Write an enzyme that holds these catalytic residues in place. Structure first.
Site, PDB file in Angstrom:
ATOM      1  N   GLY F  51       0.759  -1.240   0.000  1.00  0.00           N
ATOM      2  CA  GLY F  51       0.000   0.000   0.000  1.00  0.00           C
ATOM      3  C   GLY F  51       0.792   1.294   0.000  1.00  0.00           C
ATOM      4  O   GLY F  51       1.926   1.343  -0.461  1.00  0.00           O
ATOM      5  N   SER F  80       5.336  -6.278  -0.051  1.00  0.00           N
ATOM      6  CA  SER F  80       5.661  -4.860  -0.116  1.00  0.00           C
ATOM      7  C   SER F  80       5.652  -4.254   1.287  1.00  0.00           C
ATOM      8  O   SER F  80       6.295  -4.778   2.207  1.00  0.00           O
ATOM      9  CB  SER F  80       4.646  -4.136  -1.005  1.00  0.00           C
ATOM     10  N   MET F  81       4.918  -3.159   1.453  1.00  0.00           N
ATOM     11  CA  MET F  81       4.844  -2.495   2.741  1.00  0.00           C
ATOM     12  C   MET F  81       4.356  -3.492   3.788  1.00  0.00           C
ATOM     13  O   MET F  81       4.667  -3.362   4.970  1.00  0.00           O
ATOM     14  CB  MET F  81       3.907  -1.285   2.656  1.00  0.00           C
ATOM     15  N   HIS F 105       9.851  -5.594  -2.392  1.00  0.00           N
ATOM     16  CA  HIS F 105      10.283  -4.942  -3.622  1.00  0.00           C
ATOM     17  C   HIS F 105      10.556  -3.465  -3.394  1.00  0.00           C
ATOM     18  O   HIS F 105      10.451  -2.969  -2.271  1.00  0.00           O
ATOM     19  CB  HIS F 105       9.234  -5.122  -4.731  1.00  0.00           C
ATOM     20  N   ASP F 154      10.085  -7.636  -7.869  1.00  0.00           N
ATOM     21  CA  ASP F 154       9.341  -8.436  -6.896  1.00  0.00           C
ATOM     22  C   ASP F 154      10.092  -9.714  -6.517  1.00  0.00           C
ATOM     23  O   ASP F 154      10.450 -10.540  -7.373  1.00  0.00           O
ATOM     24  CB  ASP F 154       7.942  -8.762  -7.439  1.00  0.00           C
TER      25      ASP F 154
END
Lengths: 173, 4, 4, 4, 173, 173, 173, 173, 173, 174, 173, 173, 173, 4, 4, 173, 4
Positions: F51, F80-81, F105, F154
């Protein structure tokens, strides 16, 4: 080609909204008619609600750029930029049919972004407002401050009134 | 429809 | 525009 | 692009 | 309600973009808390990307309008009006968590219509630009010239740098 | 309310996309729990695709801002986050279920406008890229250069591989 | 409240599409029911056409995360991730109503971007393909080979066909 | 037509994005030109941002299928498939104007559906990826791993830098 | 074709937005006219609000690629790339009608994606910005430093100021 | 409830654009308070960009209708129908925080159809224009030719200028 | 809610566009007040632009069906069906605030399809036109011919004129 | 070309909506048919529902501008501006087929914005309405007051009635 | 143009919905064949579902306007105004192919606005109802009331049935 | 609105 | 694209 | 024009959906061929999925209306109205290519509105259904009962199978 | 509506 044929008689038709595209057509038709014969009058019939100012000025300068006098005839209406070009024809040859309407006002526009950019655009649209009220006073005989005041809002008028204002020279009764 |  |  |  | 329970501990929380709807909720909670106790401090947590200038102003003035001191704490971020509000906190009580980012800039807006209406909007946004730059220079200790200079474009800075610029007082480790 | 019933056991569920609204909600739950008892651990369950970065950082910092140790448990996925948050949990208390997917990533973003503005945004995003990379390296024991190279694109991994990389502490059975 | 009263009886319904929010709703319920009584069985009624894999796995891992046995009861249908969860119920407690239909297949998804990224996404979807084929195999007396062949395309079965295939333990009547 | 007036001079213009429709037009012009004089050289001016690979490959394979030499001249820009095509010009006759930019990168694409089908697309894309780089190394002199490393992420360069890189032979100063 | 007729006299009109199709047309006419008579001057009338950079340079180069001197005449306006092109006219043969508007500024654009791709796009736009200001300094006699400063935001000029600034040679009265 | 609660303190919040749904709420709270205590003053906080003339007048007429004195406080901004309402507060009870922006202008509207119908609308909006330039003149102490001239286009003023102008009585400072 | 506390003081608020949904609410409120003190007056505040004719008639008929007197007060405006309902208030108890606006006019409608159906609908709208104008005549004292004349096109009047006209009994101060 | 062929016999067709586009085409045709023979009569067949007023007036004035007699023949219908133009045909030569329908009315338009602008538009449209009722009265031999009364709303009539009213002179049976 | 060739054989095709544009094309052809030879027969082939009433009436009248006898042949279908026109053909020369279907009905339309305007439109469409029912009975031999009864709703019939009804004269076998 |  |  | 060229050989192409516009172009072509020689065969190649009923009916009737034999030839496919027309070719000259598909079914359509009109539309399609079936029966040698039941639903068949059923005479090799 |  109905329009092409009238072109051979040195008749140019300016109808509808004015934009770069339409301007490019009129400019081209004026350059041509000059190569064709640099000493015969050209007749620009104008029925327009106005449009893009720079597009409008390209036509205006071209009219003065070429050698032949360009007479203007208002038939439907000459509003805003349209009324501007009408008043730009060769002196003594700015006409209108009775029942045509003329309208002059101040420039319109928009701006988005940072205060710096909005300021730049506002000043620029203001440069154009003064530039146009200026030429408008030079074409009609009105004082700059008078053109500036009657132009603050949309100013409508008949062929006769337009004639007295000094935007055209004669109403073709 | 019919509005007054 | 205004029409008839 | 502004309208006169 | 979780939020309503933190309000009970005198914590408000801004979060999200700022508009009239959001501003009015903040103001209400500020006035409410003042009623419940005009001496106890208030913790206004800010995580905002900014918003409508006047909406932020309503929050800024309500803060200085009530009696309790309103400390500010930046979590996540405080940009545009978000950073303005962060700096407007009670002197000595403007904070931020270690990894928050702070960004200040100049006003953004829009105008369309007559050249006259545009000059008026441009002028009004310019007035807001100067007003906030002075208040911002005033809250940080920077000179009006330095603020005007650094906010011409987006100026991003960490919580540490924001503290060193005068925007906040301490960074909680 | 069930979700509210779980908060009572000091359990916070973070699921779906992370933005300001979701971030604020979590933060309010962290602060509330702290008020209740500042020494009891907290379980932050995470099933998130990732996000908004500043939104995630507000969560990260608040987990370290409060007194309670915030244990993280990855279910479904943490990418991710999401994976960044999972790795920010209390040392030796960062878990994951056996079939969870973890992916890290580099930040994603966008910019539009003048070259000048695009540049400043590019710089700001490269700032977060480096800030978060350094934090992942620190959190996992991994090297910065190694972190940077693996998050160029990624990088997916199993719960077991995650533990090896150093992102979580234990995989539950 | 309905659905709620059924929770007091320890039954949870997984109805419709499967996504993070639906999953969060399910694990929350599973976690809640355990805190309540880490002993009594849990009835997981399923009527779903499937959904997001990670969302499903989070329900799976949680099922076997808590202590109480999670028996599954298929009503209407259990397709894809739905049939997966069905088979993951407490060995010996996986049921289904007489006229329900079960369906297993391979993962679905998409990839856009540079060839390098499409490759990563492709490799990950395949990694999840093998992972679920294996778990699926283990949940039934089938071989990895037999599962990999029957799921290459939609494989619809009836309840009895489901019992004999090894996805459920018995078909009530 | 004016492009037609140039086709007589064995000049062909390739503008905008490349697809079947555009490619088709180019091939036909190449077939025609050599079916008009298999000895005289062909001039392929290129200003394109790239496009469909198979569409580009049909142009490439045609440029070599015919007999006359097809020199390539880069005007404005030559990116992705556009750059590929430019380098495929008659060895020794690959030109570019002074301020034209050239850009190379790896292929882009997409895939939706069952993992099997995604894998098939991923593989086909990686295939064309290898083929492209391979042909690029042969046209520039660079190594295969040098090209592969350079086409990961867009690689922009001046005409001058493209002459050095070996994509073109000369810059018409 | 009233335009083809004008092409007959070596006059090319570049009107409206500059993109690849508009550039290919102008470039095609520029090659056609060099073929007809490599010694006669060419009149390029410009009324453009600007456009795509690489498309513009495409025209820029070709102009300096063919043997004939290409005079530029600004009618209406020459903005952004339009202005740049206006200034590239044959030294001594760059004109403007009395009421034209000229505007120069910095490159506009956008980027979206990974921090790496954004950075790459950011760098390229900076490459173009520097490249164009540089050519601008050379054509006007202004210093690179001065061009950079004046084009940071939209810089509007009257025909007379454009002459004084060095972007043009003379204003036709 | 945060708003219900503040209402218990005679505080009414007018926030955002004015339309029937918003004025109805304001009138409802105004009538309510008078039924609670037709004597104690009322605090009408305004932060609005304006809205439907009609909806504004309902609020205005109700403010004078009820017995309680209605003090107005401008926070953020008070533009168009917002500034008009602000200037309608009980004389001596009209306030503004120091950084608010006050703005006044002439009305806006639309008109379509037969010339007869456009004239009716044109006339009805001109009637509203004259009526409000009168109420503004009366509330500010300015002449009717001054209100007319200044409101021809958007007229922005700071809190101080709004006091100088007469739209408000005092600028509450920190 | 606030509206439910005024419904305690015999107050009803009819605001906005009238339709079946809204009339059902007004009606229900009147029936409810019928239940309570059937001799006490009711204060129906009206700020409406009009609405569905039949919907409005359900409110009119209900006002005259219940035993309690229904006083009507015009705040803001009462146009079309609202002017109608305002005039139907209990004799002597029909008011308005000093600045309201009252406007009356003929029914508006639509019809499509076969000639026969258009005539059917046209007859019904004409009937409703006759009914309404008739009740307005009774209510104000005006004659049938006079109401038909004034309601032909929109008829706007102040609170005073509305009184002089017979639609309103008194104007409060 | 069908229309081009009837144009040879002096037959001009005015079909459908009237706007600047169709107006400038009818105008051109009429100018053309005058340079071909200023003596012979022109037959203008009208099948129109109306359109833009100024556009319409352009046709009317042109009809009276040139020397040829412009006869008008109504086929299908002539409504509003269409009926106006019909009535403007050369006195004595205004015709209509037996089952055509003529309809006259008052002008339609719109205004949006500040009171002052709505007012200016309202006065312009009224001035246009006066202008045309005058010409319409002049053409049919009716009193200015009669036309205004009869054209308050749509006044339909058969070819027969139209002649008895004075809009036409004869109905070709 | 194929239709153009058939025109030289005096054949005209009316296919699809009738509207002013289509109606005017038919009229223009009928006036052309008239000028080409006023004594020979014209063949009007009709395949239409119908359309705008006035558009059809201009064709009907132009048919009797010109001297040439106009035979009508229904191929495919002649419904609503399509059947109407078929029956308007020259006596004894109204034809149809064997499987063609003929349908007649009452007019269709729409009205929106004030009750007074809906009445006007309602009366106008009914007048067109009676008007065409008349011409239908005239052409069919049938009586008004019978025609009125049969057109109340879509009246479908065979070629033979159309002949027996009097709409057609003969069925070309 | 105007955001700054 | 990139607009100059 | 390739299509017009094939017209000289008396070859007509009916490809794609069938509607009035397409039917008209076909009827016209046939009408023209019978003119150019009322004795030579016409080649009608068919590849259509079908279309509007009365549209194909006009084509069918025109085929038997003209003097020349119309040979039908199926390529690709002939379905719905397309198959119908194929079978209407001149006895002995109804052809089909080896791999074409032929399909026949009952008619499709729709009704909406009052039950009186729905009934009317219903049995109108029943009429066209009966007509079609019967015509298929007498074109193929199949009984009405056989056809009726075989078209109850889509009946696809190959070329050779189409010969067996009697829809065509021969399958070219 | 009517604003201003």
């Amino acid at each position: 080609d109905i329009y092409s044929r009238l072109l051979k008689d040195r008749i140019v038709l300016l109808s509808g909204e004015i934009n770069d595209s339409v301007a490019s057509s009129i400019v081209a038709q004026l350059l041509f008619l000059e190569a064709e014969d640099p000493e015969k009058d050209i007749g620009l019939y104008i029925n327009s609600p106005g449009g893009v100012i720079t597009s409008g000025l390209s036509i205006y300068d071209t009219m003065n750029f070429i050698r032949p006098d360009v007479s203007t005839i208002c038939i439907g209406q000459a509003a805003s930029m349209g009324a501007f070009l009408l008043s730009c024809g060769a002196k003594g040859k700015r006409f209108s049919l009775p029942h045509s309407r003329i309208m002059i006002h101040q420039p319109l526009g928009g701006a988005q972004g940072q205060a710096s950019d909005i300021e730049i655009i506002s000043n620029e649209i203001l440069r154009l407002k003064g530039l146009m009220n200026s030429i408008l006073a030079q074409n009609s005989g009105q004082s700059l401050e008078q053109i500036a005041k009657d132009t603050d809002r949309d100013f409508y008028m008949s062929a006769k009134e337009a004639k007295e204002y000094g935007l055209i020279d004669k109403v073709l009764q | 429809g019919f509005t007054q | 525009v205004l029409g008839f | 692009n502004v309208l006169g």
